Amino acid sequence: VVGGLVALRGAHPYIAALYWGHSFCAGSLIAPCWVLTAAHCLQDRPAPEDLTVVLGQERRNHSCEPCQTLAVRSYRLHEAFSPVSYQHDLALLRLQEDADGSCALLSPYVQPVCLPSGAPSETTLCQVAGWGHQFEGAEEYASFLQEAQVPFLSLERCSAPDVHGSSILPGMLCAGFLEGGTDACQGDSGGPLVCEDRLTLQGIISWGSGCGDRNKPGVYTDVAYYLAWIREHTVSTR
Numbered sequence: 001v002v003g004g005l006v007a008l009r010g011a012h013p014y015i016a017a018l019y020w021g022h023s024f025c026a027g028s029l030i031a032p033c034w035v036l037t038a039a040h041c042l043q044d045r046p047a048p049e050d051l052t053v054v055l056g057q058e059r060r061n062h063s064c065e066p067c068q069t070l071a072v073r074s075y076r077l078h079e080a081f082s083p084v085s086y087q088h089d090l091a092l093l094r095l096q097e098d099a100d101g102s103c104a105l106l107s108p109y110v111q112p113v114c115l116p117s118g119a120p121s122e123t124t125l126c127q128v129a130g131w132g133h134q135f136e137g138a139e140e141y142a143s144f145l146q147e148a149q150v151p152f153l154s155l156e157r158c159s160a161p162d163v164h165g166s167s168i169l170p171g172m173l174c175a176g177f178l179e180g181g182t183d184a185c186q187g188d189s190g191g192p193l194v195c196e197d198r199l200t201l202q203g204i205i206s207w208g209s210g211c212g213d214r215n216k217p218g219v220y221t222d223v224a225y226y227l228a229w230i231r232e233h234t235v236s237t238r
């Protein structure tokens with residue numbers, strides 16, 4: 001996150017850290033057993049046994065008193081996810097219940113975030129959070145989680161020829177300052193864009209041109225657009 005701030009412990013208790021191989025992504029816990037992220041993150045289609053999800057984590061790849069480490073049962077990328085257009089950039093993970101029957105154990109550090117209903121949030125208080133780059137082409141991802149306030153943007157305004165033009169396709173959503181300076185960056189993807197009335201996951205950190213460049217707001221998967229997709233993909237192993 002560029003132009004952001006170190007967050008308090010538990011500031012974003014719905015953020016998920018995804019680790020596999022020599023790879024990393026973020027995600028958003030939407031229910032005790034369910035995590036939402038970007039499709040591009042898991043492009044490489046790792047076997048689900050290879051994934052580790054860490055909940056309630058303050059620092060990238062650090063153990064912590066309230067950290068929770070779960071396996072993954074199964075997961076699904078959106079069938080139509082395009083790595084040309086970046087359209088339909090989301091994926092849904094079903095976590096693995098521990099030997100008692102529980103997935104995420106709710107705590108002050110580990111908490112799902114409601115989905116929207118898309119009935120729709122012009123210029124509310126919206127925060128983005130992540131462990132990604134603190135500036136474009138930084139050398140390492142952040143250690144402590146970062147947060148930034150970032151305003152929603154109209155499609156009209158975002159699709160303007162000198163902003164993002166016709167790159168912005170249905171299922172996408174812009175959020176950022178046209179003047180630049182604050183934004184998501186590489187390493188923030190899968191992670192939450194959250195807005196308030198009530199706290200709801202409006203966006204999934206997806207793509208962008210640079211990080212917080214003038215007339216280049218971050219693009220996000222429009223969660224509300226995919227509510228049906230999400231419902232109909234809640235099948236799981238037993």
Ligand SMILES: *[C@@H]1O[C@H](CO)[C@@H](O[C@@H]2O[C@H](CO)[C@@H](O[C@H]3O[C@H](CO)[C@@H](O)[C@H](O)[C@@H]3O)[C@H](O)[C@H]2NC(C)=O)[C@H](O)[C@H]1NC(C)=O
Pocket residue numbers: 017019020021022052054060061062063069
């Ligand atoms: C930091 O990133 C690491 C990836 O580089 C990640 O390593 C993973 O950690 C878990 C242990 O929690 C391992 O899981 C399995 O290990 C043995 C079986 O061999 C079992 O006893 C365990 O129950 C479990 O099934 C993963 O194998 C390991 N993955 C890799 C790729 O090495 C860490 O979890 C990350 N740590 C934090 C705190 O974020």
